[PDB]
Design an enzyme around this catalytic site. Structure first.
Site, mmCIF file in Angstrom:
data_model
loop_
_atom_site.group_PDB
_atom_site.id
_atom_site.type_symbol
_atom_site.label_atom_id
_atom_site.label_comp_id
_atom_site.label_asym_id
_atom_site.label_seq_id
_atom_site.Cartn_x
_atom_site.Cartn_y
_atom_site.Cartn_z
ATOM 1 N N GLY A 159 3.386 5.915 10.027
ATOM 2 C CA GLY A 159 4.754 5.702 9.631
ATOM 3 C C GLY A 159 5.347 4.369 10.040
ATOM 4 N N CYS A 180 4.205 1.254 9.383
ATOM 5 C CA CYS A 180 4.079 0.131 8.456
ATOM 6 C C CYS A 180 5.444 -0.342 7.970
ATOM 7 C CB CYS A 180 3.174 0.504 7.256
ATOM 8 S SG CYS A 180 1.493 0.716 7.848
ATOM 9 N N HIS A 237 0.799 -1.212 0.000
ATOM 10 C CA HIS A 237 0.000 0.000 0.000
ATOM 11 C C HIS A 237 0.840 1.275 0.000
ATOM 12 C CE1 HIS A 237 0.161 -0.219 4.600
ATOM 13 N NE2 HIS A 237 0.455 1.051 4.378
HETATM 14 C C1 LIG Z 1 1.149 2.516 7.880
HETATM 15 O O1 LIG Z 1 2.211 3.232 8.500
HETATM 16 C C2 LIG Z 1 -0.129 2.793 8.629
HETATM 17 C C3 LIG Z 1 -0.038 2.383 10.109
HETATM 18 C C4 LIG Z 1 -1.252 2.766 10.962
HETATM 19 C C5 LIG Z 1 -1.477 4.278 11.086
HETATM 20 C C6 LIG Z 1 -2.107 4.444 12.472
HETATM 21 N N1 LIG Z 1 -1.638 3.268 13.189
HETATM 22 C C7 LIG Z 1 -1.180 2.295 12.410
HETATM 23 O O2 LIG Z 1 -0.773 1.185 12.794
HETATM 24 N N2 LIG Z 1 -1.210 2.102 7.932
HETATM 25 C C8 LIG Z 1 -2.275 2.748 7.447
HETATM 26 O O3 LIG Z 1 -2.403 3.975 7.486
HETATM 27 C C9 LIG Z 1 -3.375 1.887 6.833
HETATM 28 C C10 LIG Z 1 -3.304 1.961 5.311
HETATM 29 C C11 LIG Z 1 -4.361 1.147 4.584
HETATM 30 C C12 LIG Z 1 -4.193 -0.333 4.839
HETATM 31 C C13 LIG Z 1 -4.320 1.457 3.081
HETATM 32 N N3 LIG Z 1 -4.639 2.359 7.361
HETATM 33 C C14 LIG Z 1 -4.905 2.370 8.681
HETATM 34 O O4 LIG Z 1 -4.201 1.871 9.540
HETATM 35 O O5 LIG Z 1 -5.993 3.122 8.955
HETATM 36 C C15 LIG Z 1 -6.179 3.365 10.372
HETATM 37 C C16 LIG Z 1 -7.435 4.156 10.707
HETATM 38 C C17 LIG Z 1 -7.576 4.384 12.220
HETATM 39 C C18 LIG Z 1 -9.068 4.341 12.468
HETATM 40 C C19 LIG Z 1 -9.567 3.404 11.404
HETATM 41 O O6 LIG Z 1 -10.631 2.783 11.432
HETATM 42 N N4 LIG Z 1 -8.674 3.436 10.387
HETATM 43 C C20 LIG Z 1 -8.914 2.827 9.091
HETATM 44 C C21 LIG Z 1 -9.108 3.892 8.003
HETATM 45 C C22 LIG Z 1 -10.288 4.763 8.337
HETATM 46 C C23 LIG Z 1 -11.544 4.493 7.806
HETATM 47 C C24 LIG Z 1 -12.636 5.287 8.130
HETATM 48 C C25 LIG Z 1 -12.492 6.342 9.003
HETATM 49 C C26 LIG Z 1 -11.257 6.611 9.555
HETATM 50 C C27 LIG Z 1 -10.162 5.826 9.227
#
Ligand SMILES: *[C@H](O)[C@H](C[C@@H]1CCNC1=O)NC(=O)[C@H](CC(C)C)NC(=O)OC[C@@H]1CCC(=O)N1CCc1ccccc1
Ligand SMILES: *[C@H](O)[C@H](C[C@@H]1CCNC1=O)NC(=O)[C@H](CC(C)C)NC(=O)OC[C@@H]1CCC(=O)N1CCc1ccccc1
Lengths: 300, 299
Positions: free
Chosen positions: A142, A144, A40
């Protein structure tokens, strides 16, 4: 004494690099002439909601991937995708590449996490793969590409790479073949897990550790059959205890002279009665992220 | 919130073993000096009440076996500084990080790289208790294992392990060989003072709860530092120092809650109890997360 103990992280630290595509930056794992990272990183905002990864990846050039190991840029000479991980081939081999392998761990097993940001290691801690295939990690933006691992002798067994946080604040990721643990997907969506359960064989190990360190207030004169224990354990959303679990607890049983099924009778009383304000090994909750092996090695 | 250790690799590259006769412990190899507990020179029977000065007079450089792995480092000089031995060796450690020796305060935390025969086995986070013990995890052969913090790229070495007390907590020195607390390196029964709760860290923990939206316990009152310290001692909490007030500064600024207002909230929790609620998913107030630790994990 008894502490949640992580493996020493040096061998993994010398593999960590920073990987950038577009305005996204996360960590990669540099083994020999390959860098592994979450796919991603190729995703833009408009991509993240329903990324057609094969379609997005084919449109990328080697030169769209900026890989930095400290002061040095590594030249990507090829790229491919294995499930949810991207493999960036580079023109230079990591000299610090340890002896390693890639493993897929079972729920209830533990491993150390080396949390990294912009390719730099920041902390290390111990985690278990939950029965619902999440992990209770400490991961910020950051992080990931941070990896989880075990070390057996001179060998690093990599078992986890980090991809995401769920709304409840737990975390989800893949093995190093890019297959997720659990029913999760690398898209920017709110995903719930299945209901978690407690890792019983690990609670039992930890109770034995508490005895080894002089804490015994929770013991009792009673025993239980394995099936009657499991009936109560499931009622309270604890995993069933198998005969292999019982066998694994032998060494701890011998060392302390407490039959496994005697300790099960203690745990049953703790589940039905609670801790009545008291604590075990400092905790007010029953801890389930120490395996029998974790307790054995640390306590001799 | 996890207990999180610093990455240990910069310290792993400095671990060696030091042997005198059959007594082997760990040493710390920085530049061309190896640091270790002086009691390596004691037979098991000498440990009951050693005369370190007299034991060292009989020692020569060639009685000291220093090994990185199976590779011998020749000792070319030796000196005793308080309770540590400094052994000059003929090779400068190519893996020496930028480093400092620091003496930490009770309440402060640090990572321990537990080592046996010069090999790291595990890393974990410790707090220095107010009675100057640590709740470690150490077996026979662990002495010379060190505790450290990493600021940017500089390793600040703060602890070297020497011993276990009757209560099963641990005691040791800084890297100048001065013990933390009133302990001595003699195989004699010694007692730690009664321990107390690390107030500055509890306050850090309350800030952490507020940063995460858990703020039921905040109240409209404040207090003086002196009034708070006098009340806190009655609950076997440590008094706050000016330095404690200072290191809560960033969390105070981040949340907009003055340190002394947070002290008033904690006083009410001490005086009235939790009335059955939880903070951050716990009825227990945690005291081994410093304000730095809270920042490392929230921001
Ligand atoms: C990569 O560094 C990062 C690590 C995350 C960031 C916060 N804590 C972590 O461990 N990964 C990502 O940002 C993911 C990327 C995707 C797989 C393309 N997304 C992710 O982790 O999203 C987190 C947020 C927190 C609250 C939640 O539900 N989400 C999912 C996305 C989202 C959807 C709807 C509303 C708000 C957020
Ligand atoms: C060095 O590797 C080792 C580390 C110890 C081993 C067990 N866990 C540890 O942390 N240090 C020592 O063995 C010390 C050496 C002295 C300081 C010269 N001694 C020590 O740790 O003694 C421990 C025992 C355990 C029970 C106890 O009370 N003590 C202290 C001394 C003692 C008093 C009375 C009876 C028996 C021993």
């Amino acid at each position: 004494g008894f502490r949640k103990m992580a493996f020493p992280s040096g061998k993994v630290e010398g593999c960590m690099v920073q990987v950038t595509c577009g305005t996204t930056t996360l960590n990669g794992l540099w083994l020999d002439d390959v860098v592994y990272c979450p796919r991603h990183v190729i995703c833009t905002s408009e991509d993240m909601l329903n990324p057609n990864y094969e379609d997005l990846l084919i449109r990328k050039s080697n030169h769209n991937f900026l890989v930095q190991a400290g002061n040095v840029q590594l030249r990507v000479i090829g790229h491919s995708m294995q499930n949810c991980v991207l493999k960036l081939k580079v023109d230079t081999a990591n000299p610090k590449t340890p002896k390693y392998k890639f493993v897929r761990i079972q729920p209830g097993q533990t491993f150390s996490v080396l949390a990294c940001y912009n390719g730099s290691p920041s902390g290390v801690y111990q985690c278990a793969m939950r029965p619902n295939f999440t992990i209770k990690g400490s991961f910020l933006n950051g992080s990931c590409g941070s990896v989880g691992f075990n070390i057996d002798y001179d060998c690093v067994s990599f078992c986890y790479m980090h991809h995401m946080e769920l709304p409840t604040g737990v975390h989800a990721g893949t093995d190093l073949e890019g297959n997720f643990y659990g029913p999760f997907v690398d898209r920017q969506t709110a995903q719930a897990a299945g209901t978690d359960t407690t890792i019983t064989v690990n609670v039992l190990a930890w109770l034995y550790a508490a005895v080894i360190n002089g804490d015994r207030w929770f013991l009792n004169r009673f025993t239980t059959t394995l099936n009657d224990f499991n009936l109560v354990a499931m009622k309270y959303n604890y995993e069933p205890l198998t005969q292999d679990h019982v066998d694994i607890l032998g060494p701890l049983s011998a060392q302390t002279g407490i039959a496994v099924l005697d300790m099960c009778a203690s745990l049953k009383e703790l589940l039905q009665n609670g801790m009545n304000g008291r604590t075990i090994l400092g905790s007010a909750l029953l801890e389930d992220e120490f395996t029998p092996f974790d307790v054995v090695r640390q306590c001799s």
